[PDB]
Amino acid sequence: LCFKLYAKGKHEKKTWFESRDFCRALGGDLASINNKEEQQTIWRLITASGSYHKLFWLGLTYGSPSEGFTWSDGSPVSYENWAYGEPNNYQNVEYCGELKGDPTMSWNDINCEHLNNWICQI
């Protein structure tokens, strides 16, 4: 699968659901990061674009209470790269996952209605 960053204007950021709909409209989905190689591919997209210091929606979304986090594309949640202390469901409203687009490439759970950049896979 091919990944593509979407870090548009400051008023072009999207909720998790709007970002998923955008990627699905292209025939793909929000990106799942399934291993270190896919993580490095995305990091290199960030360096190539110069889109540093940005947060991006990934396909991480909470399933049932039993399952916890899932990938929107159905991939197994095997590889994980949560930031230390995450996921923390801060204030009980954080059911989607974002990438901090810095060298750590770490994940954080946040409120799905937050406006973020996003990464598609196609």
Ligand X SMILES: CO[C@H]1O[C@H](CO)[C@@H](O)[C@H](O)[C@H]1NC(C)=O
Nearer to Ca ion, 72 or 108 (CB): 108
Nearer to ligand X, 49 or 88 (CB): 88
Q: Are strands 29-30 and 3-6 parallel, antiparallel or unpaired?
A: unpaired
117 is an interface residue for ligand X by CB under 6 A: no
Residue pointed to by tokens 């594309």: 73
Nearer to ligand X, 29 or 94 (CB): 94
**Residues between 29 and 88 with contacts to ligand X, criterion CB under 6 A:** 86, 88
104 is an interface residue for ligand X by CB under 6 A: no
Interior/surface letters 73-84, b for 16+ CB within 10 angstroms, e for the rest? beeeeeeeeeee
Cβ-proximal residue to ligand X, closest one: 90
Between CA 114 and CA 11 the distance in angstroms is 12
The structure tokens listed for 16 are 């998790």
Q: Which of 49, 47, 45 is nearest to 3 (CA)?
A: 45
Query: Which of 44, 90, 113, 122 is in the footprint of ligand X by CB under 6 A?
Result: 90
Residues in contact with Ca ion by CB under 5 A are 88, 90, 94, 108-109
Residues in contact with ligand X by CB under 6 A are 86, 88, 90, 94, 108-110, 114
